[PDB]
Subunit: 336 residues, 3 copies
């Protein structure tokens, strides 16, 4: 009742972590603080609240991924509805757990403010993604204060998937989106300059082409890409044609800035949760991996969860799905 006695917030205790290299941006590459080139390779897990509700928010989950799936990175898709439902204090307390778990395993976290829609008009694809510019700023303000100087938390992915859904949500306007990302980056850098902001384009974070002429005017950032199989639609389906289309919309970015494909994956058109744009016969797997390997692109596969699709696992015993078995071997081999 005494609102005047509500405490000011505290910061994560960095002394509680074991030594872990910071990742930073240098030119078009990530590097660690030993100066070695670094690639994020890993997976999304589900929202923290979804996992808690079925008692699957456990260090054992992180251990499975680190020990058996070859990941060096986990992306946490923090859904605004879940952020509100647990409330900031409880959600941050669970993020703290993820930090300790990842640190102990020597892996890194991408914190993703997981909305879909058009923030400047505050209209979204679905209520679970609902937010405001105010809440979005406040999220990043809180996150940046709490995890200041924490090497485990490497990337702040400002807004998962910008889209206006054919301008039903507003008029897509690069200049206003650019300005807003720059505004968020400024709040972040005022609080912690050691973190990597990740910025996305339109068409559900597929289209980075506006940065050819109007890149975000801030240093030390990276760009997101979500190159699902059906985003590029060549008439003739082969490596060369897909590569050219990917080149044009997002791959070119990797020549100048670091790029993380923070969502990618596929399921068979008749498989579990099959929907546009994730339907593929499986030929996309080797093709996107080859493409990313050639361009030095980082990635986190969607999704290491048995309910949300396309799945990497069919159950909580971690039985691999088609894409799961494929990416697991890719990541194990890369780790070598």
């Amino acid at each position: 009742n005494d609102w005047w006695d509500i405490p000011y917030p505290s910061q994560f205790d960095v002394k509680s972590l074991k030594t872990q290299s910071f990742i930073s941006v240098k030119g078009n590459k990530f590097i660690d603080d030993k100066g070695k080139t670094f690639t994020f390779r890993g997976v999304n897990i589900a929202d923290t609240g979804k996992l808690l509700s079925r008692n699957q928010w456990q260090k054992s989950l992180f251990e499975e991924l680190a020990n058996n799936w070859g990941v060096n990175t986990i992306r946490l898709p923090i859904h605004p509805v879940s952020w509100r439902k647990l409330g900031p204090d409880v959600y941050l307390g669970h993020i703290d757990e993820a930090v300790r778990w990842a640190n102990d395993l020597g892996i890194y976290l991408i914190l993703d403010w997981h909305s879909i829609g058009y923030l400047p008009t505050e209209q979204y694809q679905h209520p679970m993604y609902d937010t405001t510019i105010k809440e979005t700023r406040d999220f990043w303000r809180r996150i940046t204060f709490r995890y200041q100087n924490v090497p485990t938390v490497a990337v702040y992915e400002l807004f998962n998937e910008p889209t206006t859904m054919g301008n039903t949500l507003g008029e897509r306007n690069w200049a206003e989106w650019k300005t807003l990302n720059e505004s968020l980056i400024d709040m972040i850098y005022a609080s912690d300059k050691t973190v990597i902001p990740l910025v996305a384009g339109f068409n559900w974070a597929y289209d980075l082409s506006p940065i050819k002429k109007a890149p975000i005017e801030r240093e030390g950032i990276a760009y997101a890409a979500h190159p699902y199989p059906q985003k590029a639609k060549p008439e003739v389906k082969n490596d060369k044609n897909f590569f050219k289309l990917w080149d044009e919309k997002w791959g070119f970015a990797a020549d100048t800035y670091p790029v993380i494909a923070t969502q990618l994956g596929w399921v068979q058109p008749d498989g579990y949760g099959a929907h546009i744009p994730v339907k593929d016969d499986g030929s996309y797997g080797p093709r996107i991996v080859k493409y990313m390997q050639k361009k030095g692109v980082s990635y986190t596969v969607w999704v290491f969860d048995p309910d949300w699709s396309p799945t990497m696992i069919n159950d909580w015993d971690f039985t691999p799905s088609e894409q799961g078995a494929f990416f697991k071997q890719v990541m194990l081999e890369a780790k070598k």
Copy 2:
């Protein structure tokens, strides 16, 4: 609890309706899809929630109006407080009923986002009208998706009565209001181009004069006018002087665009719920009807309800008030 299992929305089933002409804008006229000039002539009823609370939300209400009062149109004043109180899903479910009822009777609906105040500062005449730009956009987003390709729903009246109340609510600024209406129209047209947006001026939707120099830069729209009796204040009260004042503030619009007088009416200064600007000795009735007839102006009288004033009916047996008996005969004669 599982927010991730909350369904995506569905659209009204157009196959459930009987054949009904679409109304569209051509130049300064409405026409039906047989190419014949069309005039909206009808009434407002109360907010859906008010009617539900006294069990008056019934097809019989629509039947009374269509069969005995000669209407071809009903305006639904959706109050934002009621929208929130029933919640979108339940409110839309009742709008669905209105659509089926009106369609069956061969009449049309105007959906009116019924707020009073200044949306750009989000300040209003009364809490019952309280909203935000975000909620207003979301309302129109939901409405346009749900009633796509539904002929019965003819007009989307974006914001009932713009006013700053002597600039106590903000600084009235045509350019910012124009831009915001254009933004809403763009969201709507991205989703359904077969609907007619209705745009209002300041001074409680009385003053359209800014469109002489700066009309909304979008095709297929109409303009609202609320010419209550005491809005124009000639020193000498006659046809000629009122006509000239109406000409100057709103009637001129009918020369170039279609105009719907979506609110109009009167009660005696000593009658039920008498207040500025609806007080009149009754001479306004024939005068506004003559004026509208000469200019081909569409109209929906306020209000076909026994509680809200000025009333068209004194009870739920539909006993006519003074203005009610007057307008009933006007509409019956026009229908012939």
Copy 3:
């Protein structure tokens, strides 16, 4: 349940007050309506809700201050969280009490919308200060309507302490802040032109220097200053060096506009609730009083409360603290 029956608001009954001079702005001075120069000299009390919760919201509080502490002014720091918690109707009802109490004692009130942070991004120092541009406008709309033509309520302090906290809350931008204050002033002046708006600069209302080149372009306003002891940091601590630094950041304003130091005070570095920027050995007391006396600056000391620091009183028997005993004698002597 019947939202349509929710009453429109009413105004404070001015006939309930005894005769009391209006205070107005003339050049760089306040004057009363007898044309005599006037200086606000008094204190802050705690938020109305805090006082109510411990049964300390009583006329006896105002009587103690007027009769024994020599005040002619009390500042009410209305915290947005408390505004929401009591709700506008109940909070305004208690403000009405303060008005009657102050009027009877011949003292004046400053109503302070008591937030800390950056309103244009709606990010704040602490949740208790949380608000929006919409809520802030609505507060001033309600206040200005209710207390129209009430001499007892002299000053509307638009936003207590603007700060971006090292730009962690947003990018401080004088031009956008200026525009927003002008917008609030316009809402206020549209409703009551007899009230004095009080505008603040950045750095927790310490830095008025932007008004040298870009003052608020409205007449009849005053400027706030919060010159706590540790805001100016001269290497050599004496009258001359502090005076020069105060001159440069806020004191210059008093040459052209009226200035009210609506928060000021100190506690010993080892005293109760000691924190930056209010720690001082006590030499600040005579120095700030001398400075303000020379420049004709008005002031309300923070704070006449035994819980909130720095205190003027150590208990509810009004036992004076160090700064309390000091300021009490200053105010008693000035009153003579």
